[PDB]
Structure 1
């Protein structure tokens, strides 16, 4: 989440508690949809998430990922029935995606042998919300919305023998496949996990579930409105699909094995958000928001792989603490049809294929509308780059850019 939804909400540091954010409010604060211009709003957009990562060896070897992006489409329509606003939409998004290739050290056996396995990641989450909004009384504005989330997980991951040995020795790695493959992998081999299938027959690790939120707004003054919204815990099942567990010996021998894999217990925590937007002049508006993701309340993960020959189970325990986000955003009416936006956000061990989220983000946004019904919104969010290190004694450097773009046509009732 953190960064909100939509070209304007993202160009404004992820702020969204109480100002027109567009059709994307269907996920953030649907109560803001009542601030929409008279009529019905059709919205179309594209999300692109560039990622730059460099991981280094204890020998000066590097594996980098960034070396063409995933583009997520965004369709949605909001309708006005008197005081009501009803809206539906499909919101595609990545939430992980790395590609280190197969010529890197991450693809070598605890031993030095260069295997040909890739090392990559890709998480895709679709959100198709159904929601409404009621302007209950000129002052407050009710707003609810249910979801339906579709998650897909692509994985390509090699673990040199020392890593499996410690998992195994820690008791975090179990299964009947331990005693049968252990001799093959040995001292200088590894194990590779692959989740490469797509869609449906394909296998493809995915899950479908529900989700939802509700919020509200209030205008104490004539240019200062306040907002808040509560998000429900994502009730997603286990991600399940086909996976190939493949053992590699000290001389590069490969012993693949197809089966089922389940990535158990993970949802997405409930979040509480409080904020306020204020207009100074009349062409300049400023917004500040404070978000609280209840990660710490996720006590309820694993990875269960199972085949005809046996299975392997990995028990990797979180250690989660609620996170807090502080965001501020600016919008400026520079022309009669050109707005300028900008903002900042503030958040608060390794594994190169699943990078941790970034602490800070600096965004820029712009709006240009040809008519009073046709608008184009742009946004560019930079996830500030942070360094961080841990045989495999690694060090990682990770930054991230974000482009969102959408065309917004306003229709009129006849």
Structure 2
């Protein structure tokens, strides 16, 4: 998910700054760099995880806070069969999460009138890969995976007269419902979208992933994996447009939205992992999320009986280059403590921008040598993005790999 595109997935990878390319990082490697999967301890792994995110947004004097938690699964298994590793897992996760609720100015119709409309968002994505890793020459490990993605979303966005007009001017907002709803909303209104068998407003695309590894030294590994842009489908499902008059009179139309071109771009990451001491470990990858390679427009069509409304949004997103280092010491044949960091390189309270800086802590507590527990937590370092607004996330994951 991450509401634009970044790096770092997995219980042990999150802890190491989202490094992943060259080394082992559990079954998440299925959605990271399947080649890496080869390094797995002989046998058949079987992890269970609990990924967790939460954002604290503070938009503005006019305070509007975010919180007023979605926890996702991680059933995965990676069987072995000489030189050949085979895995398949489900990987649920949030990333987009806000709940300003109905009380703040985001709920203030033009003319600062308090509507009782909610302002919230939640994008959930469940990746589900099926791939493999292969040992070709105790130096070359190839691996790839093809996953079924299932995106779901629910919004509670409110737009004041102003920006609805702004959307018109820009040549973004077309419709038919517009003419007619104009003059009822007027320079003092606000429109409001609400998505909640009930469609749910979800989609079902496909994802691709292939990567390699090369033991350059016996203390240096080189890695790379290409990530095909996921082919999500169209987000479809019941929704409710509510023209709100310049004084609070609500006109609710019920129809069905269709979000088109929700892009999750491709990415090529390159990294290494050195171990200049049979205890202390270090990792480092450079990621490239190819956003500039997205030229079409995200289209939000809404259809009711009385008519429709549509918003076009062209992409215009340049490339994102993520650099990230990792590390991991072994307190002993029990504890393993890791810690990494990763620097990455339209105020809209309901969809906060990805953060660039990140600090990550974590460790691993083995207790069987056939069972293990990984624990990671990543800090989204605060950025200050008229409407001043700022936020900072806290991601925490925990997986228990019962080496069968």
TM-score between the two structures when normalised by the length of structure 1: 0.95
1:408 aligns with 2:401: yes
Is the Cα–Cα contact under 8 Å of residues 161 and 191 in structure 2 kept in the other structure? yes
Residue 406 of structure 1 and its aligned partner are, at CA, apart by: 0.7
Q: CA deviation at 1:332?
A: 0.3
Whether the 8 Å CA contact 2:24–2:39 is kept in 1: the answer is: yes
Deviation at 1:20, TM superposition (A): 0.4
Indicate whether 1:240 and 2:244 are aligned. Answer: no
Question: Which is further off, 131-140 or 145-154?
Answer: 131-140
Secondary structure of residue in 2 paired with 1:5: coil
Distance 1:103 1:266 in 2: 30
User: Once the 2 structures are TM-superposed, how far is the Cα of residue 95 of structure 1 from its aligned partner?
Assistant: 2.2
Q: Which residue of 2 aligns with 1:6?
A: 10
Q: Which whole-Å deviations, capped at 9, do the CAs of 1:297-330 have from their partners, x for residues lacking one?
A: 0112121101111101111222111110001000
Mapped partners of 1:171, 1:344: distance in 2: 41
Q: For residues 241-263 of structure 1, what are the alpha-carbon distances to aligned partners after superposition, in whole Å with 9 as ceiling and x for unaligned?
A: 11100000111000000111111
Are the counterparts in 1 of residues 6 and 289 from structure 2 also a CA contact under 8 Å? no
Match of 1:261 in 2: 257
Mapped partners of 1:51, 1:265: distance in 2:
25
Select 2:326's aligned residue among 304, 324, 329: 329
**Does the aligned pair in 1 maintain the 2:7–2:287 contact within 8 Å?**
no
Matched, 1:202 2:203: no
The equivalent residue for 1:119 is 119
Once the two structures are superposed, residues 85-123 of structure 1 have per-residue CA deviations (whole angstroms, 9 ceiling, x without a partner) of 100000001120100010111001111110000000100
2:296 counterpart of 1:296: no
Equivalent residues of 1:145, 1:212 under 8 A apart: yes
C-alpha distance in structure 1 between counterparts of 2:317 and 2:383, whole Å: 20
Give every structure 1 segment of 4 or more consecutive aligned residues whose post-TM-superposition deviation is greater than 6 Å.
Answer: none
Given that residues 13 and 328 in structure 1 are in contact (C-alpha distance below 8 angstroms), is that contact kept between their aligned partners in structure 2? yes
Residues 121-163 of structure 1 show CA distances to partners (whole Å, capped at 9, x for unaligned) of: 1000000000111101111001010000000010001111111
The SS at the match of 2:178 is helix
Alignment check: 8 A CA contact 1:2 1:14 kept: no
Helix, strand or coil at the partner of 2:163: helix
Aligned equivalents of 1:288 and 1:378: distance in 2? 20
SS at match of 1:183: coil
8 A contact 1:3–1:9 mirrored in 2: no
User: What residue is the counterpart of 1:312 in the other structure?
Assistant: 309
- 1:330-366 deviation digits (Å, cap 9, x = unpaired): 0001121100000000111211101110011100010
TM-align CA RMSD = 1.1
* SS in structure 2 of the partner of residue 25 of structure 1: helix
Q: 2:40 aligns with which of 15, 36, 40?
A: 36
- Please give the alpha-carbon distance, in whole angstroms, between the structure 1 residues aligned to 2:165 and 2:264: 31
| 2:98–2:350 CA contact under 8 A, matched in 1 | yes
Distance in 2 of aligned mates of 1:332 and 1:109: 55
Query: For 1:62 and 1:358, how far apart are their aligned partners in 2?
Result: 21
- Taking the aligned partners of 2:6 and 2:313, their CA distance within structure 1 comes to 24
CA distance in 2 between counterparts of 1:357 and 1:386 reads 10
For residues 174-213 of structure 1, the aligned pairs below 5 Å read: 174-195=174-195, 201-213=197-209
Query: 1:267 Cα shift?
Result: 2.4
Q: Which residue of 1 aligns with 2:153?
A: 153
- Could you tell me how far apart the structure 2 residues matched to 1:353 and 1:381 are? 22
TM-score calculated relative to the size of structure 2: 0.97
For structure 2, list consecutive stretches of 5 or more residues without a partner in the other structure: none
- In structure 2, distance between residues paired with 1:237 and 1:208: 5
